[PDB]
């Protein structure tokens, strides 16, 4: 096989939560041996793919810098497939991709209804996972476009199902998580319950898994529309109830999704991807 011990050394980062209360790694800078992993995954000849959506104004603002940065930093040295979903392919910038990078684009019906946006996201992702992505890649990552890769964001992030610790709350106590707190919603997480507050802006796993994340979230979201109720933090609140019930197998630290607005404490040792301005 490939033991956890073989690439993950949580003892290289005592300062922070490296193992979840369920023996699952939370990947921080220094804890991972990407070199070991790269070799290991390369042997498995894995392709990672990554799904980014950008609609209307969001394209000319972000989609490029995001790709550029992904192209440069996302799973370097493995076949990667950019799944770019846009509302108007004309505006789609066809920027030069490096080696082991390839893309395919898709026109989607645009937004606009506040929480149809990220209800469609989930349907489409899953629709694709089933339609091709599952045959195309060994691991899928779905990220918001309004962020930019800053450094190597690599296979150390690969996992069965992978959540992103939300950058603002990682050091916080659950009962203060902007979870959905209304028992009436499919995203209800009561106080006392909860391990981390995950970020909707990145999640991934095997496509089998991501399908299942996108689906349950979709079912959640939909449910909450038929019950005439917006969730406090939208598809993020479902993404979260989800990872409550189906604990992620790997968690990426805020280093993988840092808001520079927070500042940059001693916990953030090497930012892999930052949010946009």
- Before 241, cis peptide (omega within 30)? no
Per the residue annotation, which of 64, 216, 236, 255 is the catalytic one?
236
* Packed helices 117-128 and 235-245: angle between N→C axes, nearest 10 degrees: 50
Strand partners, 48: 80, 139
| Residue 28 assigned as binding residue | no
| Residue 68 assigned as binding residue | no
| Residue 169 assigned as binding residue | yes
Please give, one letter per residue, the 3-state secondary structure of the chain. Answer: CCCHHHCECHHHCCCCCCECCCCCEEECCCCECHHHHHHHHHHHCCCEEEEEEECCHHHHHHHHHHHHHHHHHECCCCCEEEEEEECCCCCCCCCCCCCCEEEEEEECCCCCCCCCHHHHHHHHHHHHHHHHHHHHCCEEEEECCCEEECCCECHHHCCCEEEEECCCCCCCCHHHCCCECCCCCCCECCCCCCCCCEEEEEEEECHHHHHHHHHHHHHHHHHHHHCCCCCCCCHHHHHHHHHHHCCCCEEECHHHCECHHHCCCCCCCCCCEEECC
Query: Does the active-site annotation cover 111?
Result: no
| Residue 24 assigned as binding residue | no
Q: State both tokens at 100.
A: 């082991």
| Residue 151 assigned as binding residue | no
| Residue 166 assigned as binding residue | yes
Domains and CATH numbers, the chain: 1-277 (3.90.550.10)
39, 250, 275, 252: which is closest to 153 by C-alpha? 252
């Amino acid at each position: 096989k490939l033991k956890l011990s073989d690439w993950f050394n949580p003892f290289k980062r005592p300062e922070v939560v490296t193992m979840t209360k369920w023996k699952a790694p939370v990947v921080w800078e220094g804890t991972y041996n990407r070199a070991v992993l790269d070799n290991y995954y390369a042997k498995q000849k894995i392709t990672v793919g990554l799904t980014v959506f950008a609609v209307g104004r969001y394209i000319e603002h972000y989609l490029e810098e995001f790709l550029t940065s992904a192209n440069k930093h996302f799973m370097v040295g493995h076949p990667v497939i950019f799944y770019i979903m846009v509302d108007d392919v004309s505006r789609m910038p066809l920027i030069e991709l490096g080696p082991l990078r390839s893309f395919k684009v898709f026109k989607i019906k645009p937004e606009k209804r506040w929480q149809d946006i990220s209800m469609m996201r989930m349907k489409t992702i899953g629709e694709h996972i089933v339609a091709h992505i599952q045959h195309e890649v060994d691991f899928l990552f779905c990220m918001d476009v309004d962020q930019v890769f800053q450094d190597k964001f690599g296979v150390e992030t690969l996992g069965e199902s992978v959540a992103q610790l939300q950058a603002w709350w990682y050091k916080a106590d659950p009962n203060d998580f902007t979870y959905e707190r209304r028992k009436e919603s499919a995203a209800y997480i009561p106080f006392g319950e909860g391990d981390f507050y995950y970020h909707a802006a990145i999640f991934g796993g095997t496509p089998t898994q991501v399908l299942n994340i996108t689906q349950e979230c979709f079912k959640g979201i939909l449910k909450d529309k038929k019950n005439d109720i917006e969730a406090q933090w939208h598809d993020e609140s479902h993404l979260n109830k989800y990872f409550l019930l189906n604990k992620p197998t790997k968690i990426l630290s805020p280093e993988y999704c840092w808001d520079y607005h927070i500042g940059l404490p001693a916990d953030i040792k090497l930012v892999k991807m930052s949010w946009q301005t």
